[PDB]
């Protein structure tokens, strides 16, 4: 029914290079600063970077010789054969926190009876998140999963849970150790997780669903490296919604310090441990020899999506400005800010391909994505989504050895 | 009267089929089930117990190939032969991110911290239980077979004969073999034992196992079974270390003998020995991508036993333990909306989700039913011949039933694990 | 001149399998418990013990072979050779802990220890620890030999430092492995009984004298060995008691009374060990080991129809907490419960043996008589009874049908 | 055929025979105190200082092969040739279990813990020294040569044409080379320096090095020596991390300049800066079997330098550092037996033991003494020719191993000899 592109896409020996040059974004690691207009965007090492790469239409490309294909019966398309995801900045680890995190007691070694909550025991705590590197390559944007609030099927009842699929947009937050969930709707107090995710949605890639799509336009390939361990053991203030059933313990004696049980609403903090050079997924070329799905790297619609998560460069810079210059130090004379910067350099190598548009081939392409034939001459549904637009229309070059990944292609292949 | 490889009487065809379960989901409470305590019956389960520390035991049901609508049935003779599926490939898919969950007890029997400083004063009192938590021993495993897997655990034994029997004597210990069901608890760092009967206070281990049985797979026994129906193969990866050093309140049942220490001087803080009922807390350390046993295909080339991947009775069992995704989600609902924060305005809940996708590749097999072969199969399992036309003892057990009757396909390259098959075998 | 057994022992193509079936022992991890007077009700069973199995093989010269035409009983004798071995281990991976309710720890000397305070009369504390992690297995036809430090000859005041002497001995089943405090006779070299935890504080901790076993001429003790040890220093303490060797004055500028420092604190430091993580990938057991070429001249020949398997495996040292109810009441009271500790070790020994023949010429009979005269005497052509071994009888357990058993299917592939 | 103006590999003038010999030391044992020697209280030693943090420098003495009782002397011509041993294999045997010892100082100059909380203020006072201990940087190494190894360490330099230096000024530093002797201390995490001269208070490092020199091998220098007699080969495995963050008491000699901070207020806790004389404690982390350099044979195929394993002067030097078996044993003796425990009734001691077994395989070589060779060897070391008939190292301390009466041709009678006959593809004579 669905076939590999190898049966209807003819490969040429024409290769082209394209590079984005330096890409930079600088912002605040925890929240955007709105003063709804954005003066400082939210820029964090815990964000998905989803690049929408724009390719020149090869059927309208200023080819110097157009005698290799026949516009009467054939059309051109680019296929991706190589990719290098460049990363600037040193390796480093950032930290996130909440000035009013709902931590009550430390339950690791010493938590004797007793001490009941009271009105507000929130504390000012921070942590380092779960370490994640990942890259996804495809010609349609990737699909993630997260837990959201279900249908009502009472005030303070546990919300029903539902697994949600969505397109991963640029700026979405990756999971951090507290799971892939919509914190804005499932944590009402805004105090159970750090402020950079407490009103955000944390998404994890739906690798299983993307792998099982028939055409395979979302996942040509992927790399991932996750790690975390549990750094501290806490519990929550607030009323325990699901009290421990009586058959799981012998109750304490009345008129005894143990006769009202403490909350078993435990929660861990995560930690990503070390970041290392030898673990890097980036700054090294990856050659697509054979995709996992039926789309063997064909960039339908003359576009390509590169999804990147890299927490190994998440260092948040401390900036300090002087309010009044005086001969002795006073805290009131200085203001403290946080800024984060991410640096990328996307390099690609593309292969020119031609498609003979017989009767059977045009039917198959129409069933796959009718917009492919309509664009070939033989509004955009993604405009509601947020992507980092990379325009490579005028960036194609045929002289590969002028550029880093092209010199590597002329050797490594 | 000799057990032989299934290769001696089962012929392989070149017919291969793919089957996939699609996404499998369960959501629940990581420590205990919630069962309509007020306003109804005890049995009525509103929220099941779902924890990354549980066994997932899938009973996969295959369509009967002798009744399957094959497009060409000229490869075998129903007059003299019967068909059976063989497992050649398997991918255990896992959704959800890697993560680590935490378990605890609001009244855990921890007395003193015995790691660095534990000076003499020493007598516990009536109730010194604390609200403590911990992260468990990390375990990954997968076992594949056509009969359910067998575990081991320690249970209360029977007392020596003509031997009493005073209350509070140390319980007799007995190693018990049993079938591992879906929802059984894996060992967590405190061993494989029946905590319900061997720990009477209900307070010596966290609440998600303190009334459970924690089982460990009896790999040795499954391997030494003559036919090898429980163990086609297995992968396992365990790790833990000791994070903290505690001791117990309560009377020390076996006092330290006097030849092992010089007693302290009376009228001195050392005149009554502290409890040497020590216990550690475990810790599973990091979870990493490179350690994963899952999300990658495994091909049965040669099973360890005599059953070389033959799925007798058109069923197969896939056993999984995966604590590398045990993150417990914190849910918080608002009781009253107010302009300032008050603890009494919010309720805290815990929920855990497990995501699976099981993919298989099966090879069609035919069996010529000669006189010796029917005799052999009858000794092995007479119910095999009865089903072929030539109640179920597993109905008391709990399995995650996966019905693949309507899920078999001959178009292998339409599916992920099938495209991968077409590269490996070179077909 | 000692020669390899390859020069006078002929190999046949006859192989046999033998398995012990499941082996279980349960006990108290720290000490044995006696009756009601002299009796072991609960043995001392600990993940820190050597397990030394004495495997008894059927005499092949008296064995009921289905075919006895491969050798000449007038001029030849039979003996077994070990070619394969799988040391099965049940029970989950885990770490147990040991301690002492009256451990001689004084101060924590890691980070903060200011000069305030004269030691006193009795400062022992109730502390525990995780031991150094050790896996090993040694295979031979004579029991293995260990090393440990013991009390020497005095050559003499009472509190003087005991003289040290390195002592060799046979490693018996139930002996304690080194734990991080060294291989020494703690019963004699630590008089207070409080400097190390109670499960070794009156025991002898032995380490295998690998150097001596390898350099013995016949090589009957060590066909091969595997070992994997690891530990780090978890805490830094010092001792109470009078410091026997005071620090010489040329190593410091003495303190003043205004600093409270004019009496030095005890520099009898001691670390606690820690074995760190136990992992699946580090395991020595539950996988076959094939003897192709032994290290010594005895290439796996089981003289006397016996084989010794020495094992240490601390990676399954979990100590179970058992809790019994004295009185059932509706509320919790500590006095209603008694707390116990139990440990269980599960083994399953599988072997594959190769039948061998020896032509008993005059030279060979001369050589074998020089090596061990009891070999010829038993062929018709026990000083180890004072030692404690886990006896494993395989006389009635040999089978020629190799593929009926786990290690026999694995043998038929490799 | 060997030029006098240039140094050449020994392969150009040393002929190898097919004669191989085994020699083993058997068990080597030393027991002592891990921190200091215990004397007789003029200067006689009752218990030596024995520590896993010491260099073991073995001087192995071989039989002169020109005077050795060979059964058949027809493989060379004593009229025109002389014999010398070449080392082809080595196994450094190590007994005792793996373990880690700890060192300390009852009066260590630690003031505050500067890792997490060190608030203002805190008055130094006259004496704040504490009783602290630590585990040292983990080090394994082995070096083989026919001359003793050369170490490096920092010492007090000479102050020339300038006597205007004040008492308590920072001493001038100078990198010093020396022969590493048996019993010298390896660096522990505080660097390779002469602590006796560069740390005057005697309290800034633990007592087992505070009046010692910690030396590190000058690998770069030994490798660049023309003849290469000190370095046939070497193996090394070092590791450490920072366990604690402390600072020193005493006056800070180099105060932090004012352009590096905004000063505090005079009537405020901050107007006298605390000492930024920081110092870490080290930690060697785990010791593991999989990391061992020893108890495995090492075969010399081709040395890095020009001396390709020739044992000139019929001697060999084996240098070993192994902190992976550094467990210090706790010994406790009873002063008075009483029915109850009293601290005063017991004495606490420390003892450390090191166990070795050195095994070698030597290859016999012959040297045809033509005119060019005699000139070449005379320029290299005239004592070689003089001993052949054709001392200065006794001021240094080495663990002397006499193997004169220990050579054997029956290679397969011995552990390393069996290992040699397999790696060489030989079958026992």
Author numbering:
A (entry chain A): 20 to 54, 61 to 178, 184 to 408, 442 to 476
B (entry chain C): 19 to 408, 442 to 478
C (entry chain D): 20 to 55, 60 to 178, 183 to 408, 443 to 475
D (entry chain E): 15 to 55, 60 to 408, 443 to 481
Task: Give verbatim lines from the article.
To ascertain whether structural divergence drives HPV type specificity, we scrutinized the crystal structures of L1 pentamers of genetically close or distant HPV types. First, L1 proteins of HPV33 and HPV52 were cloned and expressed in E.coli, purified, digested by trypsin, and crystalized. The crystal structures of HPV33 and HPV52 pentamers were determined to resolutions of 2.9Å and 2.75Å, respectively, with refinement to Rwork/Rfree values of 21.0/24.0% and 18.7/23.5%, respectively. It should be noted that the surface loops in the non-crystallographic symmetry (NCS)-related monomers within the asymmetric unit of HPV33, HPV52, and HPV58 might differ slightly in conformation due to their intrinsic flexibilities. Then, five L1 pentamer structures representing two groups (group 1: HPV58, -33 and -52; group 6: HPV18 and -59) were aligned to compare the structural differences among their five surface loops. We also observe that the surface loops of types within group 1 or group 6 have quite similar main-chain traces, with minor differences noted among the loops between the two groups. Collectively, the structural information suggests high conservation of the overall structures of L1 within a phylogenetic group of HPV, which even extends across different groups, despite minor variations in the outer antigenic surface loops. To explore the feasibility of including more genetically close genotypes into a single, chimeric L1 VLP type, HPV52—which is closest to both HPV33 and HPV58 —was engineered into the lead HPV33/58 chimeric VLPs, H33-58HI and H58-33BC, by individually swapping each of the remaining four loops with those from HPV52. Further pairwise comparisons of the surface contours of wild types and mutants illustrated that the most distinct bumpy protrusions between parental and targeting types were located on the side-chains of K53H33, N57H33, K59H33 and K60H33 for HPV58 vs. HPV33 (bottom left), and K380H52, S383H52 and E388H52 for HPV58 vs. HPV52 (bottom left).
HPVs are non-enveloped, double-stranded DNA viruses comprising multiple copies of the major (L1) and minor (L2) capsid proteins. The native T = 7 HPV virion can be mimicked by an empty icosahedral shell, called a virus-like particle (VLP) which consists of 72 L1-only pentamers. High-level neutralizing antibodies elicited by L1 VLPs can block HPV infection; however, protection against HPV infection is type-restricted, and there tends to be little cross-reactivity among HPV types.
